[PDB]
Short mmCIF file of C-alpha atoms in Angstrom, two decimals:
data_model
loop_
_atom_site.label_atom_id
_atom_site.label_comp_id
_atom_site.label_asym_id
_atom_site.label_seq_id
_atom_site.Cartn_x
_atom_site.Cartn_y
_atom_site.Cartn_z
CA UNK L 1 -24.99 -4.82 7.36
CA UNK L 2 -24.34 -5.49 3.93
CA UNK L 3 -22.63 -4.09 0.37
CA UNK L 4 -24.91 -4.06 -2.68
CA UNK L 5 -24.55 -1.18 -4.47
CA UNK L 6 -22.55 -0.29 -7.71
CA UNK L 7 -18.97 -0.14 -7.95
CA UNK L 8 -17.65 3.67 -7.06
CA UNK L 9 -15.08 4.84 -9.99
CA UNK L 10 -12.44 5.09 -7.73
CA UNK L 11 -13.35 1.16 -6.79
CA UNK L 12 -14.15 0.72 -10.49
CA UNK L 13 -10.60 1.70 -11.27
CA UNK L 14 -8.68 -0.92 -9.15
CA UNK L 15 -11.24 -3.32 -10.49
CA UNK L 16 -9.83 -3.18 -13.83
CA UNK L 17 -6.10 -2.43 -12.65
CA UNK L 18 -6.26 -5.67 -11.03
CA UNK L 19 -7.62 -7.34 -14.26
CA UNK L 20 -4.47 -6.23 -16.75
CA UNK L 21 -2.26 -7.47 -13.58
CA UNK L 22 -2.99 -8.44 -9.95
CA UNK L 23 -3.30 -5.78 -7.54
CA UNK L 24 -2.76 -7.03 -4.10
CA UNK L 25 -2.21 -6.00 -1.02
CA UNK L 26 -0.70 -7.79 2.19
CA UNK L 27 0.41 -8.17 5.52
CA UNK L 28 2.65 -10.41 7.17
CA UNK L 29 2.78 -11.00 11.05
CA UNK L 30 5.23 -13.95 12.90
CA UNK L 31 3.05 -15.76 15.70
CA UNK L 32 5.01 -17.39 18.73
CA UNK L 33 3.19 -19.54 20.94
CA UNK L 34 0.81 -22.81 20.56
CA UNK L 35 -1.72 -21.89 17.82
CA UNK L 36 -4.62 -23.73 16.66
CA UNK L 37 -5.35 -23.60 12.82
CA UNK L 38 -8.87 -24.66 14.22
CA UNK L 39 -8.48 -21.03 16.66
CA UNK L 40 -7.47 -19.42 13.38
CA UNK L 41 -10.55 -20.79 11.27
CA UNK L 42 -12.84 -19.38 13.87
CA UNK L 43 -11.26 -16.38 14.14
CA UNK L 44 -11.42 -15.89 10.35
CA UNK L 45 -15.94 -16.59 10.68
CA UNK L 46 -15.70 -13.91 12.96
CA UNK L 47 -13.50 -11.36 10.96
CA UNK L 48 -15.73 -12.04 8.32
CA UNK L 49 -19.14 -11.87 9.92
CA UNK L 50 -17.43 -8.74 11.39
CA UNK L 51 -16.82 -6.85 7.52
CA UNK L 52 -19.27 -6.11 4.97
CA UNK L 53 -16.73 -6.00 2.36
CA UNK L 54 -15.34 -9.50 3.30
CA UNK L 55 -18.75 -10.87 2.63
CA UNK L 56 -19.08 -9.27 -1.04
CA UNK L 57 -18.61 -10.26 -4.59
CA UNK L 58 -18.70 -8.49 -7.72
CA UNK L 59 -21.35 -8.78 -10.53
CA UNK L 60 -21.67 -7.73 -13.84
CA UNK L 61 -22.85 -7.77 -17.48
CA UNK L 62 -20.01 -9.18 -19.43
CA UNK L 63 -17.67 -6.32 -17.79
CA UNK L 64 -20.08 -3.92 -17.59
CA UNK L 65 -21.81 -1.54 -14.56
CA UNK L 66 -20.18 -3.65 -11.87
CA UNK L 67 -21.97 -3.89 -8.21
CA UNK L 68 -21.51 -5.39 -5.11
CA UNK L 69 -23.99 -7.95 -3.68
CA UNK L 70 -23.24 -10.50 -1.02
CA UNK L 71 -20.74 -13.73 -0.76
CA UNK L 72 -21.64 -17.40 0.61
CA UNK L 73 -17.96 -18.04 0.40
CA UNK L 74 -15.82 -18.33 3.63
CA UNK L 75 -12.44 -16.53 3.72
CA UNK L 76 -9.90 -19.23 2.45
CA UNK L 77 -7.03 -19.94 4.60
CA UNK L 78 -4.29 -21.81 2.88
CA UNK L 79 -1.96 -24.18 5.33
CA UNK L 80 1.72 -24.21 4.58
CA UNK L 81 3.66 -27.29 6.12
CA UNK L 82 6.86 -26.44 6.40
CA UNK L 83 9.50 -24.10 5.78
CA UNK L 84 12.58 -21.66 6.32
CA UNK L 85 12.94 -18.52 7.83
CA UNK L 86 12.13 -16.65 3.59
CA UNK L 87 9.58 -19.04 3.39
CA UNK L 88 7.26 -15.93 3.82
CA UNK L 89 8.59 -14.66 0.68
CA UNK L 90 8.61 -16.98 -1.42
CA UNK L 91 4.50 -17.76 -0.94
CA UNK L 92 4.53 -13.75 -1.91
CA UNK L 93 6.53 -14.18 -4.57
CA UNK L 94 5.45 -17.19 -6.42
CA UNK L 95 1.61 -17.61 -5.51
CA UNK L 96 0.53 -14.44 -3.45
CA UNK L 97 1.52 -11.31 -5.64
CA UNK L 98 1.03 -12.90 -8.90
CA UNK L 99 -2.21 -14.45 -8.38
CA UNK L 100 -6.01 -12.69 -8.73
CA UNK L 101 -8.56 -12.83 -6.24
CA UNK L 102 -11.31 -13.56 -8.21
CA UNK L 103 -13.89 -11.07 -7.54
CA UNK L 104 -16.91 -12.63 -8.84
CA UNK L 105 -16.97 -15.21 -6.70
CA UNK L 106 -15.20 -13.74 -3.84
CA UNK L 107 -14.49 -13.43 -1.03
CA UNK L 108 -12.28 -10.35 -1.56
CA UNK L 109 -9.44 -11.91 0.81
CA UNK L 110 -7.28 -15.02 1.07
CA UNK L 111 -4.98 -16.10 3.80
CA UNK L 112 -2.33 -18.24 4.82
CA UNK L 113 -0.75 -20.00 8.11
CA UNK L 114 3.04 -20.98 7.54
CA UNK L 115 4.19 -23.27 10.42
CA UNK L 116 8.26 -22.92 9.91
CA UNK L 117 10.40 -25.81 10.77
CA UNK L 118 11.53 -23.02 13.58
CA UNK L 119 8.02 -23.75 15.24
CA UNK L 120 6.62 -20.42 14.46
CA UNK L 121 3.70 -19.15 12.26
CA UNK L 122 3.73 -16.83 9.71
CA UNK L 123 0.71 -15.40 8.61
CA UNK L 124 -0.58 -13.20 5.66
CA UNK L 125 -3.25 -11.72 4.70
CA UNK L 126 -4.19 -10.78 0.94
CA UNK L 127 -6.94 -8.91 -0.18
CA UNK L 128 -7.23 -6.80 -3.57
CA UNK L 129 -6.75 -2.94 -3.43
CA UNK L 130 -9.91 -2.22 -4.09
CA UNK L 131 -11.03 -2.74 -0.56
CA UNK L 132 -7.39 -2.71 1.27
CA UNK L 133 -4.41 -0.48 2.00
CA UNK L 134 -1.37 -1.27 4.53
CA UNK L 135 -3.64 0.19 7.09
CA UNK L 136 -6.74 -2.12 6.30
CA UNK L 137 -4.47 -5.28 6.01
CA UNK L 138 -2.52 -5.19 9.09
CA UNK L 139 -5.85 -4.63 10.93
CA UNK L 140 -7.12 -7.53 9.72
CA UNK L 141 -4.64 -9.60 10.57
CA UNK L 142 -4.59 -7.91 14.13
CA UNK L 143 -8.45 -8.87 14.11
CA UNK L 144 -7.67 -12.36 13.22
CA UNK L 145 -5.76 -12.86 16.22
CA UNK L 146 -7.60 -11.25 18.31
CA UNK L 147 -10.61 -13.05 17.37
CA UNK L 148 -8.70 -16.15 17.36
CA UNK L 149 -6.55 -16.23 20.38
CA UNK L 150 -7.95 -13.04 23.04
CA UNK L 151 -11.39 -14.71 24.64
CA UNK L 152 -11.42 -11.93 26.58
CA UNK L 153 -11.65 -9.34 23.64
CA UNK L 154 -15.07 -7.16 22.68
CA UNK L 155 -16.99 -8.72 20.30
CA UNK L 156 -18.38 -6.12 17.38
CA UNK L 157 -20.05 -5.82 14.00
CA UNK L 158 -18.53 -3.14 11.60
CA UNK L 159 -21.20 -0.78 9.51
CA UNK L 160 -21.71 -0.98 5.52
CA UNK L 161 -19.89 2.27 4.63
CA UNK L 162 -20.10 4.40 1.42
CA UNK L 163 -17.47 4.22 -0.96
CA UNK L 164 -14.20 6.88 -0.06
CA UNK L 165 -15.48 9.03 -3.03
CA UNK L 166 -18.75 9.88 -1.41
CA UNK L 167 -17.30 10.74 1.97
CA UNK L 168 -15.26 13.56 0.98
CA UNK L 169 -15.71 16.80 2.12
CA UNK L 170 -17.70 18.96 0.33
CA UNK L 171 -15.21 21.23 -0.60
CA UNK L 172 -13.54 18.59 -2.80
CA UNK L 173 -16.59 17.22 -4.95
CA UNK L 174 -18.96 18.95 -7.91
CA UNK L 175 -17.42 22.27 -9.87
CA UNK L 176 -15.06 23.44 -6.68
CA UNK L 177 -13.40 20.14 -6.55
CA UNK L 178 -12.46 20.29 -10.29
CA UNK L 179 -11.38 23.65 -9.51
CA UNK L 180 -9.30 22.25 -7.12
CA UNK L 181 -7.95 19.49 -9.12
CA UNK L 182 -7.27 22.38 -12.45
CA UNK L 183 -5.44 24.47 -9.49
CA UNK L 184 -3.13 21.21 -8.84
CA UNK L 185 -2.53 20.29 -11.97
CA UNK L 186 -1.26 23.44 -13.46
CA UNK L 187 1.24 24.02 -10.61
CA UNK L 188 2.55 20.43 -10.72
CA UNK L 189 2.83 20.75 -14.74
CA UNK L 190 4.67 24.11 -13.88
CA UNK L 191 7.17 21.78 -11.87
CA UNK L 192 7.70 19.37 -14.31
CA UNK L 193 8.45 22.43 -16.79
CA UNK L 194 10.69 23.96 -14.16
CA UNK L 195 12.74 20.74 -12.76
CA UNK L 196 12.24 18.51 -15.46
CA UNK L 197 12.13 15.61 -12.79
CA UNK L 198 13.18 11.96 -13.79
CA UNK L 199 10.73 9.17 -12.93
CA UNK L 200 11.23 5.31 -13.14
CA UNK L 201 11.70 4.45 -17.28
CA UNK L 202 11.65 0.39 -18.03
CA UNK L 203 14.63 -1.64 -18.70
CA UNK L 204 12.50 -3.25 -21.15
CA UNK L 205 8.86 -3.02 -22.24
CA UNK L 206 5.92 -5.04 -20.65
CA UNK L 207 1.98 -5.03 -21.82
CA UNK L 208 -0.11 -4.29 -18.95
CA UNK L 209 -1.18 -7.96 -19.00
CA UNK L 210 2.12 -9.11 -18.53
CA UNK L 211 2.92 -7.26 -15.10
CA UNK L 212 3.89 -9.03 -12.39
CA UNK L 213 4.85 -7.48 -8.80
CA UNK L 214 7.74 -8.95 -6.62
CA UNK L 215 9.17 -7.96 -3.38
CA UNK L 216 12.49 -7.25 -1.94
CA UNK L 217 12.48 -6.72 2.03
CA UNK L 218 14.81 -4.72 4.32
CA UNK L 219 14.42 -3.67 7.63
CA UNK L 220 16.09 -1.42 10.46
CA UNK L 221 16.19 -2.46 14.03
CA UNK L 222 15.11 -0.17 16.64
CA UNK L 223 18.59 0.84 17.41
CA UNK L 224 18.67 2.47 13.72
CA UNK L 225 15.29 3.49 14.51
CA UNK L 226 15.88 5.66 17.41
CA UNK L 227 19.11 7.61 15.47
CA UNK L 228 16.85 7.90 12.72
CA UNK L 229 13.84 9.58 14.88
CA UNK L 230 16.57 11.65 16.95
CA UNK L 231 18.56 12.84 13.55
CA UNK L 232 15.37 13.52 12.01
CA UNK L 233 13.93 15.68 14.56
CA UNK L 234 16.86 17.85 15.01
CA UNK L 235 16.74 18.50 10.93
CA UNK L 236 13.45 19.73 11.20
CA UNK L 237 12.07 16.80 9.35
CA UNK L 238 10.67 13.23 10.10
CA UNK L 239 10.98 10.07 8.97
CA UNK L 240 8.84 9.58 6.18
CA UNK L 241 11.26 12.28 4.80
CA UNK L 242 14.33 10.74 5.53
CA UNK L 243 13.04 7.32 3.86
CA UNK L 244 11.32 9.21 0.90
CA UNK L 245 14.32 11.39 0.23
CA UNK L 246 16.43 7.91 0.50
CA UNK L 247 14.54 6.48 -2.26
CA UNK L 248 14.50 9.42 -4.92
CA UNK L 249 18.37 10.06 -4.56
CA UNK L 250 18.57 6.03 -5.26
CA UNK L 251 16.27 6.19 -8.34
CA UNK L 252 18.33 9.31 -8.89
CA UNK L 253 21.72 7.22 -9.32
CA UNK L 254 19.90 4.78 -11.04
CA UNK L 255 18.43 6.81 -13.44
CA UNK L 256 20.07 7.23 -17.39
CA UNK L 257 20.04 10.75 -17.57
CA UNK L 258 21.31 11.35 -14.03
CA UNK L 259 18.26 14.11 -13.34
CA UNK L 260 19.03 16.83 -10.28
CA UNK L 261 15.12 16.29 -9.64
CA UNK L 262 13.09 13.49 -9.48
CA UNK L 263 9.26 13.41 -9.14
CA UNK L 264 8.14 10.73 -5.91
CA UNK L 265 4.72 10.30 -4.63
CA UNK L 266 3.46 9.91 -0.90
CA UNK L 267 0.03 7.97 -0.16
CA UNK L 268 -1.62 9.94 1.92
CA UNK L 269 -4.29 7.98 4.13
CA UNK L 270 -7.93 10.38 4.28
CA UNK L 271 -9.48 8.62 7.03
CA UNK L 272 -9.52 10.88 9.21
CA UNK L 273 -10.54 13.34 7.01
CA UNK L 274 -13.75 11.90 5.79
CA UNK L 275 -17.27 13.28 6.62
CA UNK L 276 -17.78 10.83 8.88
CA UNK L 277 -14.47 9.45 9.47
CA UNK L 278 -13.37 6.41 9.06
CA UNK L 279 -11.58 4.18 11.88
CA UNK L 280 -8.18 2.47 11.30
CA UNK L 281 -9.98 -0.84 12.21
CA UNK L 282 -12.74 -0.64 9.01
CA UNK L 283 -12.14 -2.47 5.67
CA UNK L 284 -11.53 0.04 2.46
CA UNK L 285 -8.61 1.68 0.71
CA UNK L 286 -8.53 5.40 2.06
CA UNK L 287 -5.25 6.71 0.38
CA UNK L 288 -4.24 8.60 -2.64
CA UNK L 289 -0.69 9.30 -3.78
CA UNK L 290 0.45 13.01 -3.62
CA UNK L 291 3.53 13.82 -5.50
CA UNK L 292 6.51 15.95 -4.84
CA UNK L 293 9.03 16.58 -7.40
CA UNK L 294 12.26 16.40 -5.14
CA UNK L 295 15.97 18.09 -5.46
CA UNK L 296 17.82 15.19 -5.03
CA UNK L 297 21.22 17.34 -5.55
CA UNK L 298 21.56 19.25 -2.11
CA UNK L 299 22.41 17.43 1.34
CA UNK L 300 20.51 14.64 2.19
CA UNK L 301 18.73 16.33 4.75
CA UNK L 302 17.91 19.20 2.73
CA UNK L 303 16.23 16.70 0.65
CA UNK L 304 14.12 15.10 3.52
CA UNK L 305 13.02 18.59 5.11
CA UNK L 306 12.31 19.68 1.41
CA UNK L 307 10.25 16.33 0.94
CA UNK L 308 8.18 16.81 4.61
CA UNK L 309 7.57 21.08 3.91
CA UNK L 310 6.00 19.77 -0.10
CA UNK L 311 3.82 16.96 1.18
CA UNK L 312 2.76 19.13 4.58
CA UNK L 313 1.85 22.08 2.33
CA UNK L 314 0.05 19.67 -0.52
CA UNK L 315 -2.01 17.73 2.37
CA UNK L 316 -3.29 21.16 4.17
CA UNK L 317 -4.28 22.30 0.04
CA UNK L 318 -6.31 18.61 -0.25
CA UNK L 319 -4.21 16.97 -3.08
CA UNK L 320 -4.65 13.41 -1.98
CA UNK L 321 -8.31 14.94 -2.45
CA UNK L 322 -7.96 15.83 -5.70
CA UNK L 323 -6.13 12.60 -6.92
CA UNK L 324 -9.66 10.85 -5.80
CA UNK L 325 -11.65 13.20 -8.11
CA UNK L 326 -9.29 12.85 -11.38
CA UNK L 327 -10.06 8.97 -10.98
CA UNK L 328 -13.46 9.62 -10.09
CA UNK L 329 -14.01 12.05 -12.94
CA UNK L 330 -11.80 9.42 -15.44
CA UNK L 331 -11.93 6.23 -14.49
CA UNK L 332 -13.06 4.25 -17.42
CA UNK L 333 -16.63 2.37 -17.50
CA UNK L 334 -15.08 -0.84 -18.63
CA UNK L 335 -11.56 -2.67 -19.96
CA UNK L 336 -12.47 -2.64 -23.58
CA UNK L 337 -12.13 1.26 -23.01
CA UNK L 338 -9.21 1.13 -20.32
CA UNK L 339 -5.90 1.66 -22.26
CA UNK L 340 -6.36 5.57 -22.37
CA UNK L 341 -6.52 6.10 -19.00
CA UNK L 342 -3.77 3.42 -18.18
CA UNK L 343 -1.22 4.82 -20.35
CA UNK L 344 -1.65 8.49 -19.00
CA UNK L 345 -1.57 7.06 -15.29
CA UNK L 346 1.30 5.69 -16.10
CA UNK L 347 3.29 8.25 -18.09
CA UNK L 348 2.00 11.04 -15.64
CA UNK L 349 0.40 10.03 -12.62
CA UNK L 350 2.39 9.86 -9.36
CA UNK L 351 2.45 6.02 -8.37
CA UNK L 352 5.08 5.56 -10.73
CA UNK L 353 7.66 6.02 -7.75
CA UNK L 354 5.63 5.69 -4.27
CA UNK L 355 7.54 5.72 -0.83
CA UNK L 356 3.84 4.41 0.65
CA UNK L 357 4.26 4.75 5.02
CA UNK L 358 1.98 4.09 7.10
CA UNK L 359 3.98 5.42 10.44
CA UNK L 360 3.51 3.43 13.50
CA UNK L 361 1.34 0.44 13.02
CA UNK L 362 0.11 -0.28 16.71
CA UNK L 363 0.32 -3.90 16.84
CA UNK L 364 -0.21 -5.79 20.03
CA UNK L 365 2.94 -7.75 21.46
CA UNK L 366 0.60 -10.30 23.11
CA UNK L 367 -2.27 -11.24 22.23
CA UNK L 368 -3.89 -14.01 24.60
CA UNK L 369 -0.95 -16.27 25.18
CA UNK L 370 0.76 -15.36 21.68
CA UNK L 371 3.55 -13.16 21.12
CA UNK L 372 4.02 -11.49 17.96
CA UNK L 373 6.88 -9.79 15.80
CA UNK L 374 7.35 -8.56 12.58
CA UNK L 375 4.13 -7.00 11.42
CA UNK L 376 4.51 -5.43 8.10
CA UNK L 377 3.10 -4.99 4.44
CA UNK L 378 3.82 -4.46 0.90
CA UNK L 379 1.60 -3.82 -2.28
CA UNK L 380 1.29 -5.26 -5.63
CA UNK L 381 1.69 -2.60 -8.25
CA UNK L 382 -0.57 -3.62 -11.81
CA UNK L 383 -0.32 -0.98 -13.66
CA UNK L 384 -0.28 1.44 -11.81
CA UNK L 385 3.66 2.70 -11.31
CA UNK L 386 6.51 0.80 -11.36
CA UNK L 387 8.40 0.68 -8.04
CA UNK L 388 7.25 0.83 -4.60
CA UNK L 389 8.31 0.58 -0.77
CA UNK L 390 5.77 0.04 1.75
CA UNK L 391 6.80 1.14 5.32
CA UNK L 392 5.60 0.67 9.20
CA UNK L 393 7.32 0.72 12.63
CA UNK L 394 6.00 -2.39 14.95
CA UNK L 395 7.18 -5.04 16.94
CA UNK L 396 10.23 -2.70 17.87
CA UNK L 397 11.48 -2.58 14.01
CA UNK L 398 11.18 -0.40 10.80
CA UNK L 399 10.22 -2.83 8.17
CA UNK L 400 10.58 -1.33 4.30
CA UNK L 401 9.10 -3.11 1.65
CA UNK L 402 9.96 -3.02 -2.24
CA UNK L 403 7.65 -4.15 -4.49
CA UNK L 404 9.04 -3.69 -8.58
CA UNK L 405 7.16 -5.16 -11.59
CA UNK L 406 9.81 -7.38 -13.09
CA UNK L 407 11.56 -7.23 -16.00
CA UNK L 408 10.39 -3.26 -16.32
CA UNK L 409 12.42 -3.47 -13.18
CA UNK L 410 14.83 -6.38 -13.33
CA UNK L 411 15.85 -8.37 -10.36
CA UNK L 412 19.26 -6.93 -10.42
CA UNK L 413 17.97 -3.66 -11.09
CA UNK L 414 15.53 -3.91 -7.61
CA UNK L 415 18.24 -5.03 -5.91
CA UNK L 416 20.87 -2.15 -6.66
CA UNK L 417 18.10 0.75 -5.84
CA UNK L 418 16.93 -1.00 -2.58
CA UNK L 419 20.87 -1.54 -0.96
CA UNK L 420 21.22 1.99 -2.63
CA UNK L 421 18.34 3.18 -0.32
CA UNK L 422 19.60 1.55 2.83
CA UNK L 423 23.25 2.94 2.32
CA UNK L 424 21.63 6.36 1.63
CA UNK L 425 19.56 6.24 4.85
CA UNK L 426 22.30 4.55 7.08
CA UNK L 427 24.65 7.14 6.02
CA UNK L 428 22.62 9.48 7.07
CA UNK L 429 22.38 8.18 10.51
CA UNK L 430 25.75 7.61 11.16
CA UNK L 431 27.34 10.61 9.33
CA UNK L 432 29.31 12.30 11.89
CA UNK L 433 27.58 15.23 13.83
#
């Protein structure tokens, strides 16, 4: 199995996204136990020989009618000697986020093995968004140590796959999806008129070129977890809304003009949804961003049920659906002719402030004679929006994620809306019943 074909839009779009600024997307797992980097380098020949689109590369004609065709190149894995317990962060930080993939000689991934001075292993996996969400990456890295460590586990080869766009039901493509997509967009434009929503507004101004992603972590432990799940449930909500509705009240304080509303968008994952579907253990990016714009002036858990009603309503009408044909209908052909559709993204589209959850990622606790913790991910942003948490349950945790392109966002700035966030939520676990 093998990708050559051209570039979908929706692929073509990341493609030049991740040219103005690097759009990446990664996990991070913590291996305990004796591990080989030789176990790891096989494991990586195998996850590659496994996934078409870790054996692909990009060509074009000086930036034009991009196409996959295959890569000779073997998944990098870069070996970091040494280190404290953030020393995880600070390869995302300084070399991880920041840096491009390069496409044209691929491949579309890059790796590294931290071996902390505690005698664990942290490991992360990169690849471009273009072929990854949170989903894709943490089953990669799951794959790796399987492959790597389990000599018990299956052996298979993953199929080449159409692009997302082409998978779509019916329904949702030709003259009846833009039908869709008109119905969508005059309702949501309707909201805006109604609500008047805030949205994340720079500190200061950055050129797309000049956007860079960092990453502020927090986590819950399963303690918090549990009272979250129980408090949720009995106020008729979940909690994706309870960490959603956390986020717009904190871009709420933050915000100059102190708005009553603010507009927040959910990636919805459409695996399951595609004709066929697509498993949770395949390479691709299946989500689009569905926005809600949020009353952020009622009780908090008015504002998480409100949140969970919107997006259940929106996913059973196909917006994530109709996100995919806008940027299949839009997405420019090349980046001489980008900045149009950049600068309406950004002013209008609904990554600009993502709460992006994948729910329970099911990673193994063992895997041969490893144990493993703190599985998680978090995404680059480009140009796409301007703040970002990336959520998962595993390993007995609730790990939350907040990416921010800097100075747009200032350090400072990230750091007041993300303890904001976490005082928001933990209030609203402990208030008294």
């Amino acid at each position: 199995a093998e990708i050559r074909r051209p570039l979908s839009a929706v692929e073509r779009w990341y493609w030049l996204s991740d040219q103005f600024s690097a759009l990446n997307v990664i996990s991070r797992v913590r291996v305990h136990g004796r591990l080989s980097i030789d176990d790891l380098r096989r494991g990586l020949d195998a996850l590659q020989a496994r996934h078409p689109l870790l054996r692909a590369r990009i060509e074009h004609d000086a930036g034009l009618d991009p196409r996959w065709v295959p890569c000779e190149r073997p998944i990098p894995l870069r070996e970091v000697r040494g280190g404290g317990e953030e020393q995880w962060l600070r390869e995302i930080n300084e070399r991880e986020l920041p840096e491009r993939i390069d496409p044209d000689s691929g491949p579309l991934i890059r790796t590294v093995a931290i071996a902390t001075d505690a005698g664990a292993h942290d490991l992360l996996v990169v690849v471009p968004h273009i072929i990854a969400d949170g989903t894709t990456v943490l089953t990669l890295a799951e794959q790796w140590l399987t492959l790597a460590a389990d000599p018990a586990a299956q052996p298979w080869t993953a199929s080449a796959l159409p692009p997302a766009e082409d998978l779509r039901p019916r329904r949702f493509t030709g003259d009846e999806g833009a039908a869709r997509l008109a119905e969508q967009t005059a309702q949501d434009e309707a909201l805006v008129g109604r609500h008047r929503p805030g949205r994340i507004e720079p500190s200061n101004p950055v050129p797309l070129e000049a956007r860079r992603t960092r990453l502020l972590h927090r986590e819950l432990d399963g303690a918090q977890l549990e009272q979250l799940q129980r408090r949720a449930r009995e106020h008729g909500t979940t909690v994706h809304g309870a960490l959603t509705a956390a986020l717009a009240i904190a871009a709420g304080h933050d915000h100059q003009r102190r708005p009553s509303h603010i507009a927040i968008g959910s990636p919805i994952d459409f695996r399951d949804e595609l004709e066929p579907p697509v498993r949770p253990d395949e390479v691709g990016t299946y989500v689009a961003t569905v926005p809600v714009v949020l009353d952020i002036a009622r009780p908090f858990w008015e504002v998480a049920r409100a949140l969970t009603d919107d997006l259940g309503e929106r996913r059973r009408q196909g917006h994530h659906f109709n996100l995919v044909t806008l940027v299949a209908s839009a997405a420019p052909r090349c980046m001489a002719d980008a900045r149009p559709f950049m600068a309406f993204m950004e002013a209008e589209g609904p990554i600009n402030l993502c709460s992006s959850n994948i729910g329970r990622y099911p990673f193994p606790e063992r895997i041969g004679a490893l144990r493993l913790s703190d599985a998680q991910f978090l995404t680059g942003i480009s140009v796409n929006g301007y703040f970002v948490a990336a959520i998962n349950s595993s390993h007995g945790r609730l790990f939350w994620n907040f990416t921010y392109i800097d100075e747009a966002v200032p350090g400072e700035r990230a750091e007041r809306l993300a303890e904001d966030c976490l005082g928001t939520l933990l209030s609203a676990i402990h208030a008294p019943q």
